[PDB]
């Protein structure tokens, strides 16, 4: 979670991306839009002689 900088209409509560995934959420207690980011996925490969 980071702060979200996209402009947000007051009635707009959840911010969602192309796939309709919430990339931005409004905190209930502090109506701060928050950028939502994925958690660091990748593949483990082994180089070897």
């Amino acid at each position: 979670l980071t702060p979200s900088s996209k402009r947000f209409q007051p009635f707009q509560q959840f911010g969602r991306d192309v796939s309709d995934f919430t990339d931005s959420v409004r905190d209930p207690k502090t109506s701060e839009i928050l950028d939502i980011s994925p958690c660091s996925f990748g593949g483990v490969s082994v180089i070897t002689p």
Binding site: K6, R7, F8, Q9, F11, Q12, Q13, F14, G15, R16, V18, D20, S24
Partner: protein, 276 residues
């Protein structure tokens, strides 16, 4: 009290073309810079809208059937339109709700109402005073009432073109009147101007009753008692249809344009390509 006004000129049910206006935000979900197709109730493009006129030549407060949510537009400069009454039968037997800006505040009373068959506010000319109006002669079994914040409500008379356009969408979804509102400051001479508007929601009212009928609420501007005069006023009533629409959202997450799939074969293509 509860006056009924005689020999009102018939509205004649004049019809006009609809336009790209009548669009509202489907949901609070924020989508930006994205093309989205959605099924919902909307105002079809170029559809027929019934113009009901309270200019003064005619006064009409007809019971208008509430079908699947209505798009209301009021083109006015003196804020002559005051509110609306939504009810199934409105014969004092069934539940009805009154949403107006009566004197200074937004009032929404869901109560069984002795609906005056001619409900009209009484506004004094050159005094700018609302004489008490009996919107309901009495009230009994009042279920839901909400008084909003007080506001300065302009009731004086201004001569000109209708400088203001108040547009509302009333959707009776489940037992909820969902009202999506907007305003346009452009003044039009005598026509509902062509254009698109995006209606932000205001109230998700939980009335929980069936609404089959509704009547807008006008006001009197009689320069003399019992004369029953009115100023220039006009408005448009459009029904909504369950057709899918194609909406473009800018980077600001604001509705910028839309396309009705069913309207035109090229529009159908635009939908199927999901491109403009």
């Amino acid at each position: 009290k509860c006056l009924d006004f005689d020999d009102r000129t018939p509205p004649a049910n004049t019809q006009f073309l609809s336009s790209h206006r009548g669009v509202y935000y489907p949901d609070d979900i924020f989508r930006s810079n994205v093309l989205h197709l959605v099924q919902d109730h909307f105002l079809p493009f170029d559809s027929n809208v019934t113009r009901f006129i309270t200019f003064g030549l005619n006064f009409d407060n007809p019971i208008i059937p509430f079908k699947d949510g209505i798009y209301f537009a009021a083109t006015e400069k003196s804020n002559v339109i005051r509110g609306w009454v939504f009810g199934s039968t409105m014969n004092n037997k069934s539940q009805s709700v009154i949403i107006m800006n009566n004197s200074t505040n937004l009032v929404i009373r869901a109560c069984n109402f002795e609906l005056c068959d001619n409900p009209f506010f009484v506004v004094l000319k050159s005094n700018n005073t609302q004489i008490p109006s009996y919107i309901f002669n009495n009230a009994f079994n009042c279920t839901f009432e909400y008084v909003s914040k007080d506001f300065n409500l302009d009731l004086g008379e201004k001569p000109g073109n209708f400088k203001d356009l108040r547009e509302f969408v009333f959707r009776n979804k489940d037992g909820f009147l969902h009202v999506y509102s907007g305003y346009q400051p452009i003044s039009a001479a005598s026509g509902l101007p062509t254009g698109f508007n995006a209606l932000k929601p205001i109230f998700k009212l939980p009335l929980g009753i069936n609404i089959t009928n509704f009547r807008t609420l006008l006001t009197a501007f009689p320069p003399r008692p019992d004369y029953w005069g009115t100023s220039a006023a006009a408005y448009f009533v459009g029904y909504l249809k369950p057709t899918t629409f194609m909406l473009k959202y800018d980077e600001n997450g604001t509705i910028t344009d839309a396309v009705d799939c069913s309207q035109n074969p090229l529009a159908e293509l635009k939908c199927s390509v999901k491109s403009f």
